């Protein structure tokens, strides 16, 4: 599978890229979607608003985006890094190992869902005025019967 960086209809496909020295850029439109798969050591930079972004089967890749109407998906991706310049409702991480998100004042409320993932860190610019503050995401759950009800809870 040789490099791919083509727009098919309203879907950007960026696949099969190895150790990329220079930043891979895409000038999208709000009606387009971005799919990134089978890549390693790559930094896709999505300029302009988009409808969606999906990072699939990647190793040490980083996505720099402005905003996304429906959010972003990350699946089977290790060593990933996401940086949000503006906003997006949610970022979903599944079966991924080691990831680092960087939200923005705008994107400070971005919901985050994780499933079967590890070493995920979310940094909000809430410190000394727009100064990142890491938040290691818990990967453990406790389940038990207590006080007449069998409740669940994240491990702290």
Swiss-Prot record:
Highest taxon above the source species: Eukaryota
Subcellular location: Cytoplasm, Cytoskeleton, Actin patch
Residues modified to Phosphoserine: 87
Region (Dimerization and actin-binding): 3-156
Domain C-CAP/cofactor C-like per the UniProt entry, residue ranges: 2-137
Role noted for this protein: The N-terminal domain binds to adenylyl cyclase, thereby enabling adenylyl cyclase to be activated by upstream regulatory signals, such as Ras. The C-terminal domain is required for normal cellular morphology and growth control.
Note from the entry: Present with 8760 molecules/cell in log phase SD medium.
Subunit structure of this chain's protein: Homodimer.
Family of the protein in this entry: Belongs to the CAP family.
Protein name per its UniProtKB record: Adenylyl cyclase-associated protein
Originating organism: Saccharomyces cerevisiae (strain ATCC 204508 / S288c) (Baker's yeast)
Gene expressing this chain: SRV2
Full protein stretch here: 369 to 523 of 526
